[PDB]
Tab-separated table of C-alpha atoms and ligand atoms in Angstrom:
chain	number	residue	atom	x	y	z
Q	24	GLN	CA	-41.830	7.432	-6.519
Q	25	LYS	CA	-40.482	9.668	-8.174
Q	26	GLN	CA	-40.101	12.244	-5.351
Q	27	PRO	CA	-37.214	14.742	-5.117
Q	28	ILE	CA	-34.998	15.515	-2.136
Q	29	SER	CA	-36.870	18.781	-1.442
Q	30	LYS	CA	-39.799	16.618	-0.233
Q	31	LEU	CA	-37.756	15.159	2.665
Q	32	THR	CA	-38.099	16.641	6.115
Q	33	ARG	CA	-35.655	17.336	8.908
Q	34	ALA	CA	-36.835	16.508	12.386
Q	35	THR	CA	-35.571	19.692	14.079
Q	36	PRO	CA	-33.844	22.872	12.912
Q	37	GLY	CA	-30.553	21.506	14.383
Q	38	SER	CA	-30.851	18.118	12.682
Q	39	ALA	CA	-28.032	17.603	10.220
Q	40	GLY	CA	-29.844	14.860	8.277
Q	41	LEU	CA	-32.903	14.476	6.093
Q	42	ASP	CA	-34.821	11.360	7.177
Q	43	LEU	CA	-35.085	8.390	4.794
Q	44	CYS	CA	-37.639	5.540	5.055
Q	45	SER	CA	-38.045	2.300	3.024
Q	46	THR	CA	-41.051	2.093	0.790
Q	47	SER	CA	-41.380	-1.619	1.462
Q	48	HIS	CA	-41.750	-3.991	4.308
Q	49	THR	CA	-38.486	-5.869	4.388
Q	50	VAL	CA	-37.104	-8.720	6.559
Q	51	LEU	CA	-33.276	-8.989	6.788
Q	52	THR	CA	-30.999	-11.656	8.236
Q	53	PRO	CA	-27.186	-11.737	8.707
Q	54	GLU	CA	-26.621	-14.390	6.074
Q	55	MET	CA	-28.376	-12.266	3.486
Q	56	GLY	CA	-25.610	-9.787	3.286
Q	57	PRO	CA	-25.947	-6.174	2.061
Q	58	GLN	CA	-29.360	-5.342	0.700
Q	59	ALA	CA	-30.343	-2.145	-1.184
Q	60	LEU	CA	-33.593	-0.763	0.300
Q	61	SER	CA	-35.828	1.359	-1.950
Q	62	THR	CA	-36.810	4.871	-0.806
Q	63	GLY	CA	-38.790	6.281	-3.675
Q	64	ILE	CA	-36.612	9.451	-3.374
Q	65	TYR	CA	-34.527	10.561	-6.348
Q	66	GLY	CA	-31.466	12.710	-6.939
Q	67	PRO	CA	-30.101	15.130	-8.080
Q	68	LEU	CA	-28.858	17.308	-5.287
Q	69	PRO	CA	-28.600	21.076	-4.811
Q	70	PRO	CA	-25.778	22.740	-6.846
Q	71	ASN	CA	-22.250	22.347	-5.365
Q	72	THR	CA	-23.347	19.714	-2.834
Q	73	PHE	CA	-23.107	15.926	-2.609
Q	74	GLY	CA	-25.032	13.647	-0.288
Q	75	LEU	CA	-24.021	11.086	2.362
Q	76	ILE	CA	-26.374	8.315	3.530
Q	77	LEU	CA	-25.789	7.243	7.089
Q	78	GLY	CA	-27.713	5.255	9.672
Q	79	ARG	CA	-29.730	6.560	12.628
Q	80	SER	CA	-28.351	5.502	16.075
Q	81	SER	CA	-31.605	3.971	17.281
Q	82	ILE	CA	-31.756	1.707	14.303
Q	83	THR	CA	-28.055	0.859	14.488
Q	84	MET	CA	-28.438	-0.209	18.139
Q	85	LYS	CA	-31.267	-2.458	16.992
Q	86	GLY	CA	-28.852	-4.422	14.815
Q	87	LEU	CA	-29.455	-2.798	11.421
Q	88	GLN	CA	-26.201	-1.559	9.862
Q	89	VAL	CA	-26.484	1.173	7.173
Q	90	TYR	CA	-23.363	1.312	4.926
Q	91	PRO	CA	-22.256	4.917	4.300
Q	92	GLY	CA	-23.243	5.818	0.797
Q	93	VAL	CA	-22.064	8.712	-1.381
Q	94	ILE	CA	-24.649	10.399	-3.590
Q	95	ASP	CA	-23.189	12.343	-6.470
Q	96	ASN	CA	-24.464	15.762	-7.191
Q	97	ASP	CA	-25.700	14.789	-10.632
Q	98	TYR	CA	-27.133	11.350	-9.803
Q	99	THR	CA	-30.737	11.271	-10.973
Q	100	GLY	CA	-31.628	7.753	-9.940
Q	101	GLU	CA	-33.361	6.442	-6.877
Q	102	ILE	CA	-31.573	6.875	-3.616
Q	103	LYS	CA	-31.276	3.410	-2.027
Q	104	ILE	CA	-30.181	2.600	1.536
Q	105	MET	CA	-27.479	-0.143	1.611
Q	106	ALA	CA	-28.249	-2.128	4.795
Q	107	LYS	CA	-27.371	-5.357	6.616
Q	108	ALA	CA	-28.725	-7.235	9.604
Q	109	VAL	CA	-25.786	-7.449	12.007
Q	110	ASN	CA	-26.541	-10.220	14.408
Q	111	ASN	CA	-30.209	-11.040	14.376
Q	112	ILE	CA	-33.307	-10.915	12.215
Q	113	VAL	CA	-34.227	-7.341	11.494
Q	114	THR	CA	-37.707	-6.401	10.331
Q	115	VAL	CA	-38.193	-3.005	8.574
Q	116	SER	CA	-41.788	-1.801	8.496
Q	117	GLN	CA	-42.830	0.341	5.518
Q	118	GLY	CA	-42.423	3.927	6.640
Q	119	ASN	CA	-39.896	3.474	9.484
Q	120	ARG	CA	-37.103	6.074	9.351
Q	121	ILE	CA	-34.052	3.904	8.677
Q	122	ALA	CA	-31.370	6.318	7.537
Q	123	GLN	CA	-30.671	9.977	6.999
Q	124	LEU	CA	-29.235	11.984	4.152
Q	125	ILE	CA	-26.601	14.607	4.956
Q	126	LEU	CA	-25.707	17.358	2.429
Q	127	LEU	CA	-22.064	18.338	2.222
Q	128	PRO	CA	-20.101	20.844	0.178
Q	129	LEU	CA	-18.529	19.579	-2.969
Q	130	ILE	CA	-14.978	20.850	-3.118
Q	131	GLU	CA	-13.496	21.705	-6.516
Q	132	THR	CA	-10.089	20.266	-7.347
Q	133	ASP	CA	-8.006	20.061	-10.467
Q	134	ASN	CA	-8.263	16.272	-10.651
Q	135	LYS	CA	-8.750	14.880	-14.182
Q	136	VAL	CA	-12.242	13.700	-15.135
L	24	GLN	CA	-19.148	14.045	33.004
L	25	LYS	CA	-20.546	16.623	32.028
L	26	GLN	CA	-17.684	17.972	29.851
L	27	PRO	CA	-18.209	20.001	26.651
L	28	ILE	CA	-16.628	19.483	23.242
L	29	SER	CA	-14.216	22.405	23.787
L	30	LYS	CA	-12.386	20.170	26.312
L	31	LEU	CA	-11.416	17.619	23.619
L	32	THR	CA	-7.988	17.777	22.055
L	33	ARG	CA	-6.696	17.238	18.548
L	34	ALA	CA	-3.482	15.298	18.247
L	35	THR	CA	-1.815	17.556	15.654
L	36	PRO	CA	-2.732	20.809	13.912
L	37	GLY	CA	-3.525	18.769	10.738
L	38	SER	CA	-5.732	16.255	12.546
L	39	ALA	CA	-9.293	16.460	11.300
L	40	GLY	CA	-10.773	14.742	14.372
L	41	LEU	CA	-11.173	15.395	18.072
L	42	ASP	CA	-10.214	12.246	20.001
L	43	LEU	CA	-12.882	10.364	21.977
L	44	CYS	CA	-12.211	7.805	24.755
L	45	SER	CA	-14.596	5.555	26.765
L	46	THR	CA	-15.013	6.387	30.399
L	47	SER	CA	-15.342	2.716	31.272
L	48	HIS	CA	-13.484	-0.490	30.910
L	49	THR	CA	-15.553	-2.501	28.491
L	50	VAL	CA	-15.247	-6.035	27.018
L	51	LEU	CA	-17.020	-6.646	23.662
L	52	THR	CA	-17.698	-9.813	21.686
L	53	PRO	CA	-19.210	-10.335	18.192
L	54	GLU	CA	-22.404	-11.892	19.484
L	55	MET	CA	-23.074	-8.856	21.634
L	56	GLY	CA	-23.903	-6.680	18.734
L	57	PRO	CA	-23.730	-2.854	18.704
L	58	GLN	CA	-22.936	-1.341	22.063
L	59	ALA	CA	-23.104	2.382	22.981
L	60	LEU	CA	-19.893	3.367	24.822
L	61	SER	CA	-20.049	6.314	27.242
L	62	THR	CA	-17.635	9.238	26.759
L	63	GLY	CA	-18.626	11.728	29.397
L	64	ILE	CA	-18.559	14.409	26.623
L	65	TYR	CA	-21.723	16.363	25.852
L	66	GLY	CA	-23.113	18.353	22.945
L	67	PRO	CA	-24.043	20.916	21.686
L	68	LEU	CA	-21.742	21.842	18.869
L	69	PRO	CA	-20.417	25.155	17.543
L	70	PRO	CA	-23.015	27.233	15.590
L	71	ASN	CA	-23.643	26.077	11.975
L	72	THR	CA	-21.759	22.795	12.445
L	73	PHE	CA	-22.757	19.174	13.038
L	74	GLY	CA	-20.539	16.357	14.232
L	75	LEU	CA	-19.574	12.946	12.805
L	76	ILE	CA	-18.233	10.119	14.993
L	77	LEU	CA	-15.891	7.795	13.183
L	78	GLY	CA	-13.376	5.154	14.194
L	79	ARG	CA	-9.581	5.447	14.340
L	80	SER	CA	-7.718	3.119	11.888
L	81	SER	CA	-5.554	1.496	14.546
L	82	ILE	CA	-8.569	0.476	16.517
L	83	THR	CA	-10.478	-0.647	13.428
L	84	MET	CA	-7.582	-2.929	12.416
L	85	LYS	CA	-7.766	-4.402	15.906
L	86	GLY	CA	-11.301	-5.617	15.229
L	87	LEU	CA	-13.343	-2.838	16.851
L	88	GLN	CA	-15.881	-1.360	14.417
L	89	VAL	CA	-17.188	2.171	15.190
L	90	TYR	CA	-20.536	2.886	13.432
L	91	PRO	CA	-20.583	6.383	11.891
L	92	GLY	CA	-22.728	8.557	14.065
L	93	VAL	CA	-24.289	11.948	13.308
L	94	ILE	CA	-24.361	14.501	16.116
L	95	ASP	CA	-26.904	17.243	15.648
L	96	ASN	CA	-25.909	20.774	16.258
L	97	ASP	CA	-28.408	21.201	19.066
L	98	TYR	CA	-27.988	17.808	20.762
L	99	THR	CA	-27.198	18.418	24.419
L	100	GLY	CA	-26.899	14.838	25.575
L	101	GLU	CA	-23.891	12.639	26.049
L	102	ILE	CA	-21.964	11.736	22.970
L	103	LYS	CA	-21.776	7.919	22.839
L	104	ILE	CA	-19.609	5.800	20.524
L	105	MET	CA	-21.649	3.028	18.798
L	106	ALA	CA	-19.206	0.088	18.545
L	107	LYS	CA	-19.047	-3.634	17.753
L	108	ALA	CA	-16.447	-6.361	18.067
L	109	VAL	CA	-15.976	-7.640	14.516
L	110	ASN	CA	-14.405	-11.029	14.779
L	111	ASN	CA	-12.857	-11.513	18.169
L	112	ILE	CA	-13.076	-10.393	21.772
L	113	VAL	CA	-12.211	-6.743	22.038
L	114	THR	CA	-11.192	-5.197	25.341
L	115	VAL	CA	-11.444	-1.370	25.725
L	116	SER	CA	-9.400	0.038	28.592
L	117	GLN	CA	-10.736	3.179	30.290
L	118	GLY	CA	-9.004	6.079	28.595
L	119	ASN	CA	-8.032	4.448	25.266
L	120	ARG	CA	-8.786	6.712	22.284
L	121	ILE	CA	-11.455	4.717	20.448
L	122	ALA	CA	-13.034	7.178	18.048
L	123	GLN	CA	-12.792	10.724	16.807
L	124	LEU	CA	-15.280	13.513	16.331
L	125	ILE	CA	-15.176	15.471	13.072
L	126	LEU	CA	-16.924	18.875	12.749
L	127	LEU	CA	-18.613	19.597	9.447
L	128	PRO	CA	-20.558	22.523	8.044
L	129	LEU	CA	-24.280	22.368	8.357
L	130	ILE	CA	-25.793	23.347	5.040
L	131	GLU	CA	-29.081	25.261	5.038
L	132	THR	CA	-31.849	23.976	2.788
L	133	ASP	CA	-35.502	24.760	2.395
L	134	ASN	CA	-36.592	21.322	3.598
L	135	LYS	CA	-39.652	21.338	5.895
L	136	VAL	CA	-39.050	20.838	9.621
G	24	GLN	CA	4.100	4.285	-5.526
G	25	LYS	CA	4.709	7.136	-4.499
G	26	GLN	CA	1.886	8.968	-6.349
G	27	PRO	CA	0.080	12.047	-4.975
G	28	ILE	CA	-3.652	12.682	-4.733
G	29	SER	CA	-3.569	15.027	-7.757
G	30	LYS	CA	-3.019	11.905	-9.917
G	31	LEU	CA	-6.432	10.435	-8.976
G	32	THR	CA	-9.364	10.898	-11.302
G	33	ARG	CA	-13.040	11.569	-10.761
G	34	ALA	CA	-15.416	9.641	-12.956
G	35	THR	CA	-17.737	12.555	-13.804
G	36	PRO	CA	-17.805	16.275	-13.019
G	37	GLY	CA	-20.603	15.582	-10.459
G	38	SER	CA	-18.735	12.751	-8.738
G	39	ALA	CA	-17.950	13.650	-5.153
G	40	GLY	CA	-15.174	11.051	-4.805
G	41	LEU	CA	-11.746	10.352	-6.232
G	42	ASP	CA	-11.516	6.658	-7.160
G	43	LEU	CA	-9.104	4.388	-5.264
G	44	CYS	CA	-7.866	0.957	-6.453
G	45	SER	CA	-5.670	-1.687	-4.730
G	46	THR	CA	-2.237	-2.195	-6.154
G	47	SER	CA	-2.389	-5.898	-5.379
G	48	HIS	CA	-4.503	-8.884	-6.072
G	49	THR	CA	-6.043	-9.731	-2.741
G	50	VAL	CA	-8.400	-12.507	-1.524
G	51	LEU	CA	-10.464	-11.736	1.627
G	52	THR	CA	-12.648	-13.918	3.831
G	53	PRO	CA	-14.928	-13.032	6.795
G	54	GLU	CA	-12.731	-14.715	9.369
G	55	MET	CA	-9.776	-12.619	8.289
G	56	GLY	CA	-11.143	-9.489	9.760
G	57	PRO	CA	-10.177	-5.934	8.715
G	58	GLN	CA	-7.376	-5.797	6.198
G	59	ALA	CA	-5.489	-2.654	5.058
G	60	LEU	CA	-5.277	-2.636	1.234
G	61	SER	CA	-2.378	-0.758	-0.388
G	62	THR	CA	-3.142	1.960	-2.965
G	63	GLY	CA	0.219	3.395	-3.850
G	64	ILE	CA	-1.344	6.884	-3.332
G	65	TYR	CA	0.129	9.208	-0.714
G	66	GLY	CA	-1.021	12.208	1.290
G	67	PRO	CA	-0.879	15.113	2.039
G	68	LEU	CA	-4.072	16.825	1.056
G	69	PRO	CA	-4.884	20.288	-0.300
G	70	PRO	CA	-4.629	23.112	2.314
G	71	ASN	CA	-7.623	23.388	4.714
G	72	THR	CA	-9.087	20.030	3.654
G	73	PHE	CA	-9.126	16.522	5.120
G	74	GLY	CA	-10.026	13.311	3.342
G	75	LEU	CA	-12.637	10.585	3.939
G	76	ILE	CA	-12.290	7.069	2.491
G	77	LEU	CA	-15.588	5.392	1.803
G	78	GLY	CA	-16.737	2.389	-0.194
G	79	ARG	CA	-18.403	2.333	-3.619
G	80	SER	CA	-21.994	0.919	-3.609
G	81	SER	CA	-21.328	-1.706	-6.264
G	82	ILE	CA	-18.506	-3.147	-4.269
G	83	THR	CA	-20.427	-2.938	-0.995
G	84	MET	CA	-23.328	-4.905	-2.522
G	85	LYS	CA	-20.777	-7.521	-3.539
G	86	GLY	CA	-19.936	-8.150	0.111
G	87	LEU	CA	-16.813	-6.004	0.513
G	88	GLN	CA	-17.152	-3.566	3.427
G	89	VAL	CA	-14.879	-0.468	3.385
G	90	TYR	CA	-14.477	1.074	6.888
G	91	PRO	CA	-14.739	4.885	6.773
G	92	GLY	CA	-11.281	6.277	7.167
G	93	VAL	CA	-10.182	9.816	8.046
G	94	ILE	CA	-7.116	11.182	6.274
G	95	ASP	CA	-5.477	14.084	8.034
G	96	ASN	CA	-4.471	17.075	6.066
G	97	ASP	CA	-0.808	16.640	6.904
G	98	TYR	CA	-0.573	12.843	6.602
G	99	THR	CA	2.223	12.033	4.174
G	100	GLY	CA	2.020	8.265	4.258
G	101	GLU	CA	0.311	5.832	1.964
G	102	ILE	CA	-3.428	5.963	1.854
G	103	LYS	CA	-4.702	2.448	2.654
G	104	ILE	CA	-8.272	1.157	2.290
G	105	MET	CA	-9.469	-0.650	5.473
G	106	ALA	CA	-11.708	-3.469	4.162
G	107	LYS	CA	-13.485	-6.656	5.254
G	108	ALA	CA	-15.275	-9.493	3.510
G	109	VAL	CA	-18.791	-9.435	4.958
G	110	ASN	CA	-20.301	-12.794	4.285
G	111	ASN	CA	-18.407	-14.580	1.574
G	112	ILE	CA	-15.017	-14.823	-0.078
G	113	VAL	CA	-14.197	-11.588	-1.810
G	114	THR	CA	-11.543	-11.417	-4.507
G	115	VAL	CA	-10.027	-7.979	-5.365
G	116	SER	CA	-8.275	-7.852	-8.726
G	117	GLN	CA	-5.335	-5.447	-9.055
G	118	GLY	CA	-6.768	-2.265	-10.504
G	119	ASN	CA	-10.447	-2.650	-9.504
G	120	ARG	CA	-11.895	0.585	-8.084
G	121	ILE	CA	-12.655	-0.414	-4.492
G	122	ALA	CA	-13.161	2.856	-2.656
G	123	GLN	CA	-13.304	6.582	-3.165
G	124	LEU	CA	-11.687	9.528	-1.461
G	125	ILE	CA	-13.872	12.517	-0.591
G	126	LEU	CA	-12.319	15.926	0.258
G	127	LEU	CA	-14.005	17.911	2.996
G	128	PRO	CA	-13.380	21.278	4.602
G	129	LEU	CA	-11.333	21.292	7.730
G	130	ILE	CA	-13.044	23.508	10.261
G	131	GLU	CA	-10.888	25.527	12.660
G	132	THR	CA	-11.740	25.344	16.349
G	133	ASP	CA	-10.045	26.481	19.503
G	134	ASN	CA	-9.484	22.929	20.739
G	135	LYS	CA	-6.081	22.336	22.385
G	136	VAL	CA	-3.449	20.482	20.351
J	201	UMP	O1	-22.881	7.608	17.298
J	201	UMP	C1	-23.754	8.373	17.737
J	201	UMP	C2	-24.903	8.705	17.016
J	201	UMP	C3	-25.855	9.576	17.567
J	201	UMP	N1	-25.642	10.089	18.851
J	201	UMP	C4	-26.601	11.027	19.473
J	201	UMP	C5	-26.431	12.446	18.828
J	201	UMP	C6	-27.618	12.563	17.912
J	201	UMP	O2	-27.993	13.896	17.560
J	201	UMP	C7	-28.633	11.759	18.738
J	201	UMP	C8	-29.809	11.188	17.956
J	201	UMP	O3	-29.318	10.337	16.951
J	201	UMP	P1	-30.321	9.532	15.958
J	201	UMP	O4	-31.048	8.444	16.632
J	201	UMP	O5	-31.415	10.385	15.404
J	201	UMP	O6	-29.380	9.052	14.855
J	201	UMP	O7	-27.938	10.645	19.246
J	201	UMP	C9	-24.518	9.714	19.559
J	201	UMP	O8	-24.293	10.134	20.696
J	201	UMP	N2	-23.577	8.871	18.999
J	202	UMP	O1	-8.810	4.240	6.110
J	202	UMP	C1	-7.803	4.856	6.493
J	202	UMP	C2	-7.737	5.508	7.727
J	202	UMP	C3	-6.570	6.188	8.104
J	202	UMP	N1	-5.473	6.186	7.237
J	202	UMP	C4	-4.225	6.903	7.574
J	202	UMP	C5	-4.441	8.443	7.372
J	202	UMP	C6	-4.577	8.968	8.774
J	202	UMP	O2	-4.308	10.362	8.936
J	202	UMP	C7	-3.623	7.996	9.483
J	202	UMP	C8	-3.849	7.832	10.981
J	202	UMP	O3	-5.159	7.369	11.197
J	202	UMP	P1	-5.709	7.051	12.692
J	202	UMP	O4	-5.102	5.849	13.287
J	202	UMP	O5	-5.386	8.123	13.681
J	202	UMP	O6	-7.216	6.935	12.473
J	202	UMP	O7	-3.861	6.726	8.923
J	202	UMP	C9	-5.549	5.500	6.041
J	202	UMP	O8	-4.605	5.464	5.248
J	202	UMP	N2	-6.711	4.851	5.670
J	203	UMP	O1	-25.903	4.126	-0.401
J	203	UMP	C1	-25.909	4.488	-1.587
J	203	UMP	C2	-24.742	4.644	-2.339
J	203	UMP	C3	-24.815	5.055	-3.678
J	203	UMP	N1	-26.070	5.287	-4.250
J	203	UMP	C4	-26.206	5.742	-5.650
J	203	UMP	C5	-25.832	7.262	-5.740
J	203	UMP	C6	-24.462	7.254	-6.359
J	203	UMP	O2	-24.069	8.472	-6.995
J	203	UMP	C7	-24.621	6.025	-7.266
J	203	UMP	C8	-23.322	5.349	-7.687
J	203	UMP	O3	-22.630	4.935	-6.535
J	203	UMP	P1	-21.217	4.139	-6.636
J	203	UMP	O4	-21.365	2.763	-7.137
J	203	UMP	O5	-20.260	4.756	-7.603
J	203	UMP	O6	-20.689	4.220	-5.206
J	203	UMP	O7	-25.323	5.064	-6.513
J	203	UMP	C9	-27.211	5.086	-3.498
J	203	UMP	O8	-28.339	5.271	-3.961
J	203	UMP	N2	-27.127	4.701	-2.174
């Protein structure tokens, strides 16, 4: 894109997630397996947070599975949605809100690096 | 139901999750795809938190997949468990603990709404 | 093993997750359904935190699904990765980093126990 995370919108003040759409029209089938969908949105994330990509319920019920994805605080690449058609052919129109990004606190530990 | 989240119980003081059961007896097969299971439990959530629905390991190993679900802080509807039979026929008895609700902090950002 | 969580490493300072490998060579197929992979790493977790097991994207794209798993703060058993081959035969070499553990804050509520 390259657009940053600050450009994403949350649907309501109580909404935990920032909505993510695919930039492309994509058709998915079960036998295709996991596919990485492009968003045109780029890390990195606010200080001391990491990101979690999760599906929206509406889209899940429609047979599109979003695999939970961890976004590191310092990742500066494109944020892609890992998705699979569950049972049937799923068609993703450009600009449909497929997933959501949740920001979570990044806990410090003494683990080696 | 309508019952609130305060009515849920956690199995041990160290348990991260509040246990969720289905109110109905339900049979699930792989070709059915994602099904929304009723809990009779309703949002909303404590201030400055959001909720995450996740599966229990025992139930996962038994072939019932729970799709991660985000519950918004201000959602006042019924909390439903999005589930799928993975490989085989899964039978869910009324009152079996199928999923768990985790409460997480809702981080404030300057994202447009 | 028994090794504690403090022995795990994080790949970069910005990495949210602690990397998890299987201790065994394992072959997985779709018809096998969910399998619990041994890590040789044991709870419990730092005070006031709980753990979440999630997949790595690279491994997900390769057709290995990791089911999100909650680790309770006071769990003192072995941390196992719940996994399934999605579409094809997946082979897991001993010592490949399959999953990651994320630490999250454990919120106190007045829920009965
Ligand atoms: O597993 C789930 C996921 C979502 N919801 C409810 C709570 C959410 O705030 C609301 C809207 O979800 P989305 O379609 O925007 O994901 O649906 C559930 O009951 N269970
Ligand atoms: O992916 C997982 C999920 C759970 N557990 C362990 C830690 C939990 O505290 C314990 C009990 O899990 P449940 O059956 O209640 O989900 O199992 C794992 O090792 N890996
Ligand atoms: O759904 C996902 C999961 C991961 N990533 C990006 C951000 C991560 O920091 C980076 C590396 O992920 P891993 O392979 O280590 O999981 O990939 C995504 O864009 N989408």
